Structure 1
């Protein structure tokens, strides 16, 4: 088949579902912070696969871990034991400090597991009457595309037309303690699920003290605090978990994306015994969850973040990026925000230009990024980037923004 970008677009339009509207670029190779298309052109990756490639594309140490296990064993299922799962479980639990881990594959799967864990704990420990348990969510949230995940969404694009919704899901505003407090008055609430920073909403960072307040309010009302760190976790914001900035310990933590460096779908639910053990043998599972292959790549992927001090780099580099982005004109950039290497700028949609246009020109100029709402562009380059490369990227951003 088709070796031209236009041929690649055409073949997908014909044989694939139209559930996505991609930026017209056809990539075939990626290494570190770089991506090359079919026409041989080189691009700075400022999307990182939505934070799934924190360690850069095809990181050698992660790649070798995959190559080393494929020849040995890749899948036995959890009906038998393999030698790799135990190692990964011991490593991840001690690294984050929780008794146990429940392994799954994709991000939503981790979110569903946490909801099942919260409901089961709600009924068996808190003593909520059977099928009256509620889980509170914050407006702007994103945790996946299952029927359950779109039922807590405030985005019409996600739920409109998707049959009847999952009951028991409440929604309150984000970054609002009084709202939370009011909602937790209902003794039927089992958990509150939140993102320490809302990514898909447009990198909305809550006020300092928000996570501390949530922790206090949840502890006080005997409600589980579930932190979704699938996008904000793993060094992306400057810490192992974004929650670390306020020294807060959630009851359940969700990890996904970058947990495999982009080489395999691996996700995890971390929590202590009193919550985790409410699920008995045969009550929950997944065919590929906890397979030998994904466990090997996750160990290596976690090691790369540690050995290379990627959080520290993200933290230091994040400051420079943001500082430089605040110099741009206000008639184009109304806001700059973020933490570590998860940032965003807000474009002033006028009748001549918008975020999609800015992204296309940014592409023409060598940098890949995608808008999140038509006026919000997110910048999230692999954490392995160096200051010189970042400096180079910023020049492209300045050049592009100012050329309008």
Structure 2
């Protein structure tokens, strides 16, 4: 017969690095909100690959765009032009209303690019002395696992044993305007990079007015506001960008994950000419960045979000999810939080009972989720989920939680 789930776990243990920490389920097929394991068991996906399959697994519009282009041309590198990139660039810049886009592959690559842009703008436009430029980050931040990314992390698991660390990165508390105002007194700060909602920190939602205050302070002190929307963007929270909730325009926007609906690693840095054009020809590139195959899948992925009105559906259904979760006993679920379909519960963890064990039983009962911490479980289904499917999922969540 074919490999069992245990066969699959065992082979990876033998031949693969032990760098990940997966929930033990072994998936072989996905469609829409559903995943199937190698034994044929069916599950509601409530993780969406960390919000990278907002459009559902294997969306036929995005699949078709990939299959069509793969027969024509997949990669020239940046040594030559391809015919598709410009069409994607015009589309995405007009959608989000920035002059320009710089295409990258992974989320961390887009963050690296934003730091370089901020620094280069800092030195060549603002006039900071080389090499004294600072970038300010919020505690709890996550933007990937390069050496530079972990240098700004407050999570010991990401940075311990991996230094020495990149200089010029400062850390302040999240959701803390007085602290930003204090940090921005230093003329050498070029940018503040921040998530509108912190995903990996446990879906930490800042108070109303935070984002307007950040925009105000950054403008006041001539500092770039970089909004990392790699997890929160693209209809996930109920808008094109989570910053749309307070109608503020960051200087640089980062996109990734669901930019391709899961079909291809595509990320993007959006900003106006006065920031973008600080990087000159030859000063920054990658092999796969802007390749025609990725661009065709990103165009289709973005069109799906628009056409199916997934932002509106995420807004409507998320409030149902939160309100239903809030009905669970307080001696069990101590907090419910989120926006749109990016949500989390906090459980009253004991020594015998934690998020991991809850998630294992969830899995056994046909729903896949994963903790961010011993007491925090993230809930993020694909945005194509219908209300009846959500309520079926809610029933599974209730039954599971109350069975301990």
TM category (shorter chain) comes to: over 0.9
> What aligned pairs does 1:243-392 form with structure 2 within 5 A after superposition?
243-392=243-392
Q: Deviations over 1:326-381 (max 9, x none)?
A: 00011111100000000000011112211000000000000000000110000000
Whole-Å Cα distance in 2 between the matches of residues 315 and 176 of structure 1? Answer: 26
Q: Take 2:332 and 2:63, find their aligned partners in 1: how far apart are those partners? A: 41
Cα deviation, residue 65, structure 1:
0.2
TM-score (norm 1): 0.99
CA contact (8 A) 1:366 1:396 kept: yes
In structure 2, C-alpha distance between the alignment counterparts of 1:286 and 1:369, rounded to whole Å? 34
Give a deviation string over 1:77-120, Cα, whole Å, max 9, x none.
11111110000000000000000000000000000000000000
CA distance in 1, matches of 2:85, 2:126: 31
SS state of the match for residue 44, structure 1?
strand
Please tell me whether the aligned partners of residues 2 and 8 of structure 1 are also in contact (alpha carbons under 8 angstroms): no
Secondary structure at the residue paired with 1:207? coil
Matched position secondary structure for 1:91: helix
Output the CA distance in 1 between the equivalents of 2:152 and 2:291: 30
Question: Structure 2-normalised TM-score?
Answer: 0.99
Instruction: Please show how residues 188-267 of structure 1 align to structure 2 within 5 Å.
Output: 188-267=188-267
- Cα distance in 1 between the residues matched to 2:51 and 2:253: 17
Q: Shift of the alpha carbon at 1:2?
A: 5.5
CA distance in 2, matches of 1:56, 1:269: 24
Q: Deviations over 1:187-216 (max 9, x none)?
A: 000000000000000000000000000000
Distance 2:352 2:283 in 1: 55
Q: Which runs of 4+ in 1 moved over 6 A?
A: none
Query: RMSD in angstroms over aligned alpha carbons?
Result: 0.7
- Deviation at 1:163? 2.1
Q: What is the CA distance between 1:74 and its match in structure 2?
A: 0.2
Q: Give CA deviations for 1:8-27 in whole Å, capped at 9, x if unaligned.
A: 00000000000012111000
SS at the partner of 1:372? strand
Q: 3-state DSSP class of the match of 2:148?
A: coil
- 1:257 deviates by 0.2
- Gaps of at least 5 residues in structure 1 are none
Q: Contact conserved, 1:69 with 1:292, CA < 8 A, in 2?
A: yes
Give the Cα separation in 2 of the matches to 1:377 and 1:75.
39
Map of 1:67 onto structure 2: 67
Question: 1:136 aligns to what SS in structure 2?
Answer: strand
Cα deviation 1:198-256 (Å, max 9, x = unaligned)? 00000000000000000000000000000000000000000000000000000000000
Q: Which secondary structure does the structure 2 equivalent of 1:331 belong to?
A: coil
1:40 CA displacement: 0.2
Q: How many residues align?
A: 404
Contact 1:45/1:381 (CA < 8 Å) preserved in 2?
yes
- Partners of 2:364 and 2:240 in 1: CA distance: 34
CA distance in 1, matches of 2:374, 2:148: 26
SS at match of 1:253: strand
